[PDB]
């Protein structure tokens, strides 16, 4: 379908673009065009409107935080994350296209494993226990907030999983 193609092309990585402007800028473009926001290291204010992204020095701005709320990001769009070195915070909220496979894909990016400190996943209806468990690879994670994830059926086992795998993790659960 047309809408399927559209979502796919919103997400697809253009490697030429990564070459031309660097990973952080290319990923900023992906996020904003898909209804997400980013905040750079060194900045208080967030980037929220695509057309207002900095023109700036080549590859100077580095993503520190991502807030994807009511966003169409999914699956291979996360390949934009591969070259990002400094991402510390990610919120996924009302991301209706995200699945366990998205979280798996994220969890396997070594660059994110090294940097990630805080994650929030809220009202993403497809996400299950499998996808949450994958996040244990984010070995430096200090805070994880899960809310309104109807696919997460075994919260107690998640609590115990993280207790051993990430003993210093602050886990906040707003789950039925
Ligand atoms: As955005 C975004 C792009 C395609 C389809 C749905 C949402
Ligand atoms: Mg948004």
- Secondary structure category: alpha/beta
Q: Outline, from the CA principal axes?
A: globular
Ligands bound, unique: Phenylarsine oxide, magnesium ion
Number of DSSP helical runs: 7
Q: What's the CATH class label?
A: Alpha Beta
Q: What's the count of strands?
A: 6
Order of helices and strands: HHHEEEHHEHEHE
Termini separation (Å)? 35 Å
Radius of gyration: 16 Å
Number of structural units classed as domains: 1
For the biggest β-sheet, the strand order reads 1-2-3-4-5-6
By CATH, the architecture is named Alpha-Beta Horseshoe
**The CATH homologous superfamily:** Ribonuclease Inhibitor
CATH topology: Leucine-rich repeat, LRR (right-handed beta-alpha superhelix)
Brief summary:
This protein has 7 helices and 6 strands, in the order αααβββααβαβαβ. By secondary structure, the chain is α/β, with parallel strands linked by helices. The N and C termini lie far apart (35 Å).
Secondary structure topology:
Elements: H1 2-11, H2 15-21, H3 23-33, E1 37-40, E2 63-69, E3 89-93, H4 100-107, H5 110-115, E4 118-122, H6 129-133, E5 143-147, H7 155-165, E6 170-174
Parallel strand pairs: 2-3, 3-4, 4-5, 5-6
Antiparallel strand pairs: 1-2
